[PDB]
Symmetry: D2
Subunit: 391 residues, 4 copies
């Protein structure tokens, strides 16, 4: 059982995906936002997220726009769901074919900022704390078409303005850049969690910025998602997280969480949940940015929504059991995992004391240490047995 | 023809690779270091680099070690070759099986630092300006075997110490971390140029740290090498560069520069040479970190060394011609490449002035703008025709 | 300049792609088929191809359908273009979400066969020689959802029937199966040229079936396209070929031919054209199944169509220069490329005679042989210099 | 617990890998073959396999070779282990740098065949029923270095001779070609199970030839291993199987079976054991071609050997429970998996009758069928809940 304390959130564009892929028409009808709110509340979600254009059709008059916001607001009220994050669609409309913030056309860049400021207003009105930015069209198909340096300057210029506004309007938002390596552009700017983190460090108010890494996005480059999250945590830049499944380097599948690389899904829950001193290492929403397979109907849709929660809770349960097992505890000791936490240097020791320590070099028996095993296969086998419910 | 001004450098371990691979014995006999200096001098190299263990066999007594250094310096002297960079082998010896700076074993970590300090002294002695650090054994095969957070702490602890020592001693070294996603470990820490840049920003004297990206390592994850270099230059962290060739995600091939992704090799040379003024955007060594194919004998080795320089100079020549062509200037103008360099905002404009601009949103005709083409294919076609010498 | 003897053909869906991708709306209006015929004739194509549904909108009444065909035939008549191949759309309509021929649903399988029979009729009437079969929806997202063996039985069962019909109606069609590893299904059946050839060999009239490999599809799995086509030719199963560009394992890009892996596009043209007896090893249509980038308008569309032709002809010209070069001739000899064509055994020798030859084993000096280099790097370097027009 | 009925086998080179990788020295001392026989027997293996050079050091005199073989045979006798398959090392020695059967050098091709003939004799004497052929060095790093067509001719030439010798000597061996896409050559000939199957079909006696696919090798190309295995079984060419783990496209990891893509390992075990008629679909050895991680000592080596067997048995148990679950059955029925096994055409129905059925076209409601969901997600969720031991 999922509790609001689990903080499971879903994008309106997830369960609402009509299943129109690059090779075929939609196989499902449109989902009414209000119905989505009731259905998610019902399956145990604590919040919902949306792109401006997911809730209000691109180009609605203010009268329509207003009406829709009012109804949505009611649904949230009745159900108790919150809106932890909002995002803006800077990829669908043809105007954004070369990007929003980094489009070579100056007018498109001005327009993309306006579109986002607007969405920031709605977000603040609904109580959202995080603005997610997915630069899906920022990038290129050909190297000579995009000056990357100029593009990074323009990405920065735009973000700096957004932070200025939020701070001045007192919205208290946090901004999360969502990395993706490719698709739809041949190559997208800020392709990995690493590139996104390095970029944020260059903004005017870096403390207001972090990343929203997605499971399948890092897997599209065959990277270890868990290891990348660990690095994001070390930097304290994990502001949000998108969970889903993928089968390596191919199109973005966005399967249910745990339906792609299952072993990494397991190490991931372990990392987020078995944080320092019992407590989770991460406190934000556990957001599912996935798609119900094109072969399913609305029944299949609700099923897949629940499978995400289910997968996360089954994995958590096994990660807990894994760590609580005295035999794992023994294997951890033998592999010296915790010894990495002890500083390499003694207290107050510097280069000179180290250079004078003959045991660290002159009298060190590299051959003898080189022969002891780490017992890593055995620890790994113990984890998988916990995952399989065999221990 | 290569000039010293071209700054082509080679690792002793490139031409000296005996071609012992993961599945077979060495097909070439050892290359003598003095001989290497002399042959490299002859093909046009301006400098040579080496790992400690490439020059002085692991465990050589001091008399021996001393002897080799003297001979080496004499060859340097006679040919006029310099040592722009040096590195340390923290991957071959069995003691380094779980890493050097981040081994679970505390004693290996202490010994790893001592091994590098020692190599710093020699680099300082030879006039080297950069210390390259390739953390090839830092990472894991299994997620539960390595605490990433603690590993980054210990990687940082070791680098802070290295910088302290260099600065106290007045060595003037710059430190360049070299990223690699995998091999030999299942996953290596700091897998891409981005991850390495983000990491470096967290050290005690960041100004002293940068990266040494390798063409093939970014390609092992299917990333755009030119595009990652552009971001590195934007951050001003491109301290050195390793040029070679690769065919996508598979084992590290280390082919001659330009023998893998030729189009990306072309866009890379254009980026480095057709810099800001008219001047190169990058002023350091053009280092070839490649391996002569195992099927080749020493004539093949020397041929492959020259091929590296030849590919660079041929691409440079076409990159220059590309930029000088009036038809290219016209295509650049139609694709609005330079328009990206113009700030999105007018001087003195903030969010208040932007919100007041009805033309940036309320009266913006997105449909009309979305219908004009960027002419990117045509620009790409002209570039390719310059590469093929078709124009 | 392109001549009709070059046999450049294009699908109506290539230049006609409106650029609606998985993440955005169409950026171009629909292309009139008659206009398409005219435009293509002007750029040098010798033929056009299409899916039933590209020409005649799904669900057109007889009258309309008839109407369309007649205008289409007129345009061909007027222009001199032929229809070398026709294919059927079994991927767009929601009914084919689980496949056409191997849908779990039997009624869909029966419907798919009917839909193809109809296209075979139109194809025969237009003079097409080849029926291309692209099983884009044949596959699965989940392993337990598709019995592969049963799917292969049903695939075979449908193809046997089509051959039967063609032969009885006297159409004289050849069938070409087009492999693709994934997209739109998580995994597609007959994922590579290899798997498709193996399958075809199990049909009732195997001499009527071959493959239609596409450059990008094999590259999506990081395979060597030229090498796979060389195997297809060895088997005599290259019934057709789709030329385009791709940048390794990622979504299907469908770039202009030679805009992806340039070195492999070069070796491919050399293989097809520099066939034995001076003559091309392949005599069918050089078909471009590519897509004008979404950033482009109709001018970029015709520009991209011409670029496909120009790329092929520039590569052809360099592949011939390469083979005609005496130094290449000398490098080929040193590499023993042609010695591979001489049988391993002397005429009349069998295992008995080989076992009696002490020189092949007992007295063989493996060590002296293993020390000689093949000069492959030098040969590669010469190929590339020819590609760069540097020789 | 493994029984001899489980038919688990290991190559001497698996537990015997000294862990010398491409970047480092061995971390383990050599394993005595007799000791390996005893240890394997002890963990439950029914057989052992080996390359000629694993047992008898390359270049041993006949007296030495004969002694090794005799001691070997005694161990086999005393433990009751058998030798189900043997193989030949055609990749280690420098002489094989351009391949064995397909080296451009004629004399190497002759020597390669004699090395294999000699191993067939020893195989036949130890009772081996399968000869595995892994052409690790047959391929190229550069496209112009190898005539593929000539290479396939030579490959075929060598294989026909081997079948001939075997048949004449009454050895009754079956031959299994083992595909691999790359490593150690840039591109290896016959890269996937598909390509090997298509090739085998062209030999003089195809019935004696099949494939020895390895889990990681197909995953190196990001292909679906279970799905390719399903196709191999449909062709009846699965003569042997190598089980291991891999994490997508990167160097060959050869991890314990199930430690790579766990979900694919689970569906593979289901396919092999839950064959048609209750019984397994495959009855050959379950061979582990893996390597104990370089971080391990001999304790870790035996732990990893046992992990392979444990992994197989755990997955088998879960696969069995999966299929005996009435809810799973119900989901299978709802997903129509079995309906694929029913011919598409009715008994005696031909194209004439198909064309006459208006229910297959004229009166087919594509739109209504297209709207029904297949329930695939739900089925996948039950599969994973079984693997997790949650059901
Ligand atoms: Co995604
Ligand atoms: Co996401
Ligand atoms: Co490398
Ligand atoms: Co390097
Ligand atoms: Co195609
Ligand atoms: Co394609
Ligand atoms: Co392997
Ligand atoms: Co194997």
């Amino acid at each position: 059982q999922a509790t609001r304390e689990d903080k499971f959130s879903f994008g309106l564009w997830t369960v609402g995906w009509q299943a129109r892929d690059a090779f075929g028409d939609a196989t499902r009808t449109a989902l009414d936002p209000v119905e989505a709110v009731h259905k998610l509340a019902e399956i145990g979600a604590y919040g919902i997220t949306f792109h401006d254009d997911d809730l209000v059709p691109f180009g609605s008059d203010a009268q329509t726009r207003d009406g829709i916001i009012a109804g949505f607001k009611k649904a949230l009220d009745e159900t108790g769901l919150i809106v932890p994050m909002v995002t803006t669609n800077l990829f669908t409309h043809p105007v954004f074919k070369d990007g929003g913030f980094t489009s070579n056309d100056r007018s498109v860049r001005r327009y993309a900022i306006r579109k986002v400021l607007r969405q920031m207003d709605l977000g603040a009105e609904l109580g959202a704390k995080t603005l997610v930015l997915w630069g899906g069209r920022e990038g290129a198909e050909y190297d000579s078409a995009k000056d990357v340096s100029a593009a990074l300057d323009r990405y920065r210029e735009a973000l700096n303005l957004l932070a200025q506004y939020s701070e001045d309007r007192g919205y208290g938002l946090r901004f999360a850049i969502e990395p993706k390596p490719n698709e739809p552009r041949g190559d997208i700017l800020l392709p990995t969690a690493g590139h996104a983190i390095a970029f944020v460090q260059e903004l005017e108010r870096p403390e207001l910025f972090g990343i929203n890494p997605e499971t399948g996005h890092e897997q599209m480059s065959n990277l270890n998602f868990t290891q990348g999250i660990a690095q994001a945590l070390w930097h304290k830049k994990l502001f949000h997280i998108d969970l889903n499944g993928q089968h390596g380097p191919k199109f973005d599948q966005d399967l249910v969480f745990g339906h792609g690389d299952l072993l990494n899904a397991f190490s991931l829950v372990d990392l987020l949940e078995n944080g320092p001193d019992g407590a989770p290492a991460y406190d934000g929403p556990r957001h599912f940015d996935y798609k119900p397979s094109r072969t399913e109907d609305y029944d299949g849709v609700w099923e897949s929504a629940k499978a995400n929660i289910r997968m996360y809770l089954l994995l958590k349960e096994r990660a807990k059991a894994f760590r609580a097992d005295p035999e794992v505890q023994e294997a951890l000791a033998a592999s010296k995992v915790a010894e990495l936490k002890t500083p390499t240097l003694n207290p107050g020791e510097g280069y000179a004391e180290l250079l004078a320590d003959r045991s660290a070099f002159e009298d060190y028996d590299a051959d003898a240490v080189g022969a002891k095993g780490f017992g890593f296969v055995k620890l790994n086998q113990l984890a998988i047995e916990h995952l399989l419910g065999a221990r």
